[PDB]
């Protein structure tokens, strides 16, 4: 019976809030409102969140504290035909760790590089600069903030493609190791530590968000940039590709499918109200994005006012924004060295809290399967991380971004989409909503309204399928800048996409064949829930 529980009600929330918050909130949320026509975008973002996004976020968290164990066992004890879903989900989380954790290493490298009176990346006259360089972002030229990030930090110019990684960059190496020594000692013992640690990582950004929020709005052109961000154009309401971006954001940002919320929620008490917790966690997430949206463009306007740069050049998503565009602006304003250290510190604490949930959903998932690795987490992770670290030297290499971008566009991209789809179907159909509700009434004391399951049973699959339909339509081969990825890399990427999903039909096939009796009555064995 007995399973370990959170230190406190807060330690749970903070973990989930921390986990669910990352640079996707910063660098894709602001850019969407901009290109999708401002606050108007918040309509489709709102609807997609309401019907599509949250119901899933709610479902993964409910199962978590109800079935009381890790992703595998949770899908084991629910619909054992589909127990493969548990497997798929976890190795996805396993995969991501080969790349995602690399970001915090860049942040700390910048952070470590931020100690000085005069910032390095403001200048076009340095050794790593080329005649193509300009002091700020310009059409047809390379910003000195970009040329710093590439020719010096990454050394990505020395890579001819993915085939050539080049030398391992060791300044990055010990930076990545520092991240794992942190992620280690955070997860090092139980949720007794990690639950407490998130109080920093899930909070500190909200602090730095503030003093950057004011510092950004005090600048000369800030009143302008906010107009760019929120200035409404309602023609987009009729644009298909707007609901795609919004629906994708709504879905990808909340984070179901990595088996984490399932994992975290497991340490919850059985009767803890997780409906309230689902709604509150969601809100903070979307809010935290909408806020940073204000934080970015106030700094963006200032560059378009004082620094005199075209908007279309500095309005950007992805790592280029936070590692190039933003720091470009900061170096200009007073107290430069201060703003840097808190920004990079914020980026770091933005990654850490998130990564924990992934590593945790892996460990917690296994601890409820293989007992003697529960006896020692304790050097289980030590292998895992050092395994991460050793492979993590691939991304620590000059062609690292090419590697990084590859796992990004492939690993969790279509893998997580189908993985969830079965979670919905298995729960809403195989397991049934009637018994899923009846579970939650025993938990929180009241069953979900006719609204929620309508999202689980119908809306969600129509919603997910809608994303992959327009996901394929807009498909192109993997490319970064002028570099087009070799089709073997593309194929190799689908393996990492397929190795996740392939678990589902694998375990489905295996078990029903590995079950005795009539083929019709060996299925009912796999339809019948563990509790029954």
């Amino acid at each position: 019976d007995e399973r370990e529980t959170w230190s406190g009600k807060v330690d749970f929330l903070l973990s989930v809030i921390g986990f669910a918050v990352d640079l996707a909130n910063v660098w894709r949320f602001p850019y969407l409102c901009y290109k999708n026509g401002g606050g108007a975008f918040l309509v489709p973002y709102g609807i997609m969140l309401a019907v599509g996004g949250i119901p899933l976020f709610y479902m993964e968290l409910a199962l978590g504290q109800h079935n009381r164990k890790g992703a595998i066992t949770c899908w084991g004890r629910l619909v054992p035909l589909f127990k493969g879903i548990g497997y798929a989900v976890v190795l996805i989380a396993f995969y991501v760790g080969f790349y995602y954790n690399v970001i915090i290493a860049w942040s700390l490298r910048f952070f470590f590089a931020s100690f000085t009176n005069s910032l390095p990346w403001t200048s076009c006259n340095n050794i790593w600069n080329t005649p193509n360089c300009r002091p700020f972002e310009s059409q047809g030229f390379q910003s000195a903030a970009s040329e710093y990030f590439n020719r010096y930090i990454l050394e990505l110019n020395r890579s001819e493609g993915i085939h050539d990684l080049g030398a391992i960059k060791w300044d990055m190496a010990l930076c990545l190791l520092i991240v794992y020594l942190i992620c280690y000692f955070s997860l090092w013992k139980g949720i007794s530590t990690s639950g407490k640690v998130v109080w920093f990582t899930a909070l500190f950004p909200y602090a730095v968000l503030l003093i950057l929020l004011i510092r950004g709005l005090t600048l000369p052109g800030s009143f302008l940039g906010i107009q760019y961000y929120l200035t409404p154009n309602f023609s987009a309401i009729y644009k298909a590709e707007v609901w795609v971006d919004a629906a994708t954001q709504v879905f990808f940002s909340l984070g179901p499918g990595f088996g984490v919320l399932l994992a975290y929620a497991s340490y919850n008490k059985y009767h803890n109200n997780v409906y309230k917790d689902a709604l509150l966690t969601s809100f903070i997430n979307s809010a935290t994005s909408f806020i940073a949206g204000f934080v970015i463009f106030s700094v963006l306007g200032y560059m378009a006012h004082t620094l005199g740069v075209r908007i279309e050049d500095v309005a950007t998503e992805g790592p280029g924004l936070v590692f190039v565009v933003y720091p470009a602006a900061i170096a200009t304003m007073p107290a430069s060295t201060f703003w840097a250290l808190i920004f990079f510190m914020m980026l770091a604490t933005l990654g850490l809290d998130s990564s924990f949930g992934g590593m945790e959903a892996i460990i917690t998932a296994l601890s409820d399967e293989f007992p003697k690795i529960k006896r020692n987490r304790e050097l289980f992770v030590a292998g895992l991380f050092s395994l991460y670290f050793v492979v993590g030297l691939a991304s620590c290499t000059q062609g690292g971004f090419y590697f990084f971008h590859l796992l990004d566009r492939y690993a969790a991209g279509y893998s997580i989409l189908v993985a969830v789809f079965f979670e919905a179907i298995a729960v809403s159909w195989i397991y049934g909503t009637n018994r899923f509700s009846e579970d939650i009434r025993d938990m929180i004391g009241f069953p979900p309204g006719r609204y929620w399951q309508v999202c689980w049973r119908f809306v969600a699959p129509i919603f997910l399928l809608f994303i992959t339909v327009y996901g394929l339509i807009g498909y192109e081969p993997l490319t970064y800048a002028d570099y087009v990825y070799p089709s073997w890399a593309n194929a190799l990427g689908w393996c990492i996409a397929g190795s996740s999903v392939v678990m589902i039909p694998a375990v489905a096939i295996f078990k029903l064949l590995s079950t005795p009796g009539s083929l019709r009555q060996r299925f009912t064995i796999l339809t019948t829930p563990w509790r029954d």
Epitope: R435, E438, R441, D442, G445, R531
Partner: antibody, heavy 119, light 109 residues
């Protein structure tokens, strides 16, 4: 509109066994957890047992448990318990009462059915 | 078990007068989980007040309720004779579920 009707019950010799049944009508029965609540001649309401909608979750009183078993037929819309090893302290009027939502209490109550346990 | 004691047990009241009844519990109770039932003589109980404040349907608004923790009260602001009955409170905070001792209203004459 909504009616619940307990049937059965009557005189029973101590140690005897019996149970009654609530006939639910007017609402979708599968979606509401039911509960049995009894009231003695001292006119004091005591809880007996609750059963979930699909009936996978069942809660009993400790003055009862092991002598009482609660059952659910959703197909026919029927709720009945099962009583065995009765006592004279088990004498009361037994109420069929429903609520799904704990936060909302018991929405609708049966007309009651009497039970007298006597030598 | 969480035992709910209700006071006072019998209550004589002249019409229009204000009456209040108290319900006190052995253990702290979730504010929303408490409830109040009205039982007229020779008929099954009725749900009167659910949550703590919230009245049921057909329940005149002259009824109100308040309190938290181990302290709760049902208040009939003004009284008609139609209000003579026995009132019970209940907690869903946990199993086994529990009813108070009951408060019997009887009109003063």
């Amino acid at each position: 509109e909504v009616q619940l009707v307990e049937s059965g019950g009557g005189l029973v010799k101590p140690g005897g066994s019996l149970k009654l049944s609530c006939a639910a009508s007017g609402f979708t029965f599968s979606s509401y957890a039911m509960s049995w609540v009894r009231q003695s001649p001292e006119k004091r309401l005591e809880w007996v047992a609750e059963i979930s909608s699909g009936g996978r979750y069942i809660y009993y009183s400790d003055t009862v448990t092991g002598r009482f078993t609660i059952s659910r037929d959703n197909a026919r819309n029927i709720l009945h318990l099962e009583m065995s090893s009765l006592r004279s302290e088990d004498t009361a009027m037994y109420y069929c009462a429903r609520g799904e939502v704990r936060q909302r209490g018991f929405d609708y109550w049966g007309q009651g059915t009497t039970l007298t346990v006597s030598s | 078990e969480n035992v709910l004691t209700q006071s006072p047990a019998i209550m004589s009241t002249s019409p229009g007068e204000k009456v209040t009844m108290t319900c006190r519990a052995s253990s702290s109770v979730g504010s929303s989980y408490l409830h109040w039932y009205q039982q007229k003589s020779g008929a099954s109980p009725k749900l009167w007040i659910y949550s703590t404040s919230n009245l049921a349907s057909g329940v005149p608004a002259r009824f109100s309720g308040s309190g938290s923790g181990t302290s709760y009260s049902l208040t009939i602001s003004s009284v008609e004779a139609e209000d003579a009955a026995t009132y019970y409170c209940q907690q869903f905070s946990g199993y086994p579920l529990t009813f108070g001792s009951g408060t019997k209203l009887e009109m003063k004459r």
